[PDB]
């Protein structure tokens, strides 16, 4: 019973498209997205069809301009609802090299700068043992966003990234 509404202009103006289930392609219904209203739960929204391109994670709320979801442009074309467990334990394993190789670290806590904490600038694979997490390109949860809502990620492309650069990560609660 969650819903997301996309508006072409800022401040919830202009033509609109709404999604109540997952939508793999609404680029023919909206030329651009400059504000969003999210109801009922948390959504992942994507620049290109079929959940491709830049992605952004939006909790319930009102977003009058794309900066409010750290958007890179006003282009969105697909979206899916994020299923969050009832606030249990959260646990993630990050790896120095692809395919779960190299050095590994396991944590239960948000990390606003992984260099100071794990002495890595990059994460080349990961296993999400419990919970749902977000990787960020820059420290303090800034820059590009990548949703980790599955279990195993063998290489960065599996979380939608072109490179293993990750500098912070946190749980979705």
Curated annotation (Swiss-Prot):
Transmembrane segments: none annotated. Residues 2-40, 41-83, 90-130, 131-173 form the Beta/gamma crystallin 'Greek key' domain. Changing residue 22 to G: In CTRCT20; uncertain significance. Residues 84-89 are annotated as: Connecting peptide. Keywords: Acetylation, Cataract, Disease variant, Eye lens protein, Repeat. The keyword Repeat applies. GO terms for biological process: lens development in camera-type eye; morphogenesis of an epithelium; visual perception. GO terms for molecular function: structural constituent of eye lens. It comes from the Eukaryota. It holds the Pfam family Crystall. Has a two-domain beta-structure, folded into four very similar Greek key motifs. Belongs to the beta/gamma-crystallin family. Crystallins are the dominant structural components of the vertebrate eye lens. It is linked to Cataract 20, multiple types: An opacification of the crystalline lens of the eye that frequently results in visual impairment or blindness. Opacities vary in morphology, are often confined to a portion of the lens, and may be static or progressive. In general, the more posteriorly located and dense an opacity, the greater the impact on visual function. CTRCT20 includes progressive polymorphic anterior, posterior, or peripheral cortical. Monomer. This is Gamma-crystallin S. It comes from Homo sapiens (Human). The gene is CRYGS.
């Amino acid at each position: 019973g969650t819903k997301i509404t996309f508006y072409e202009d800022k401040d919830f103006e202009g033509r609109r498209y709404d999604c109540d289930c997952d939508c793999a392609d609404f680029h023919t219904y909206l030329s651009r997205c400059n504000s969003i209203k999210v109801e009922g739960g948390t959504w992942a929204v994507y620049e290109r069809p079929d959940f491709a391109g830049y992605m952004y994670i939006l909790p319930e709320g009102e977003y009058p301009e794309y900066e409010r979801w750290m958007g890179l442009n006003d282009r969105l074309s697909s979206c899916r609802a994020v299923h969050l467990p009832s606030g249990g334990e959260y646990k993630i394993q990050i790896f120095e090299k692809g395919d779960f190789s190299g050095e590994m670290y396991e944590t239960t806590e948000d990390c606003p700068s992984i260099m100071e904490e794990f002495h890595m600038r990059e994460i080349h694979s990961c296993k999400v043992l419990e919970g749902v997490w977000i990787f960020y390109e820059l420290p303090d949860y800034r820059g590009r966003q990548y949703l980790l809502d599955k279990k195993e990620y063998r290489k960065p492309i599996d979380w939608g990234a072109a490179s293993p650069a990750v500098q912070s990560f946190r749980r979705i609660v």
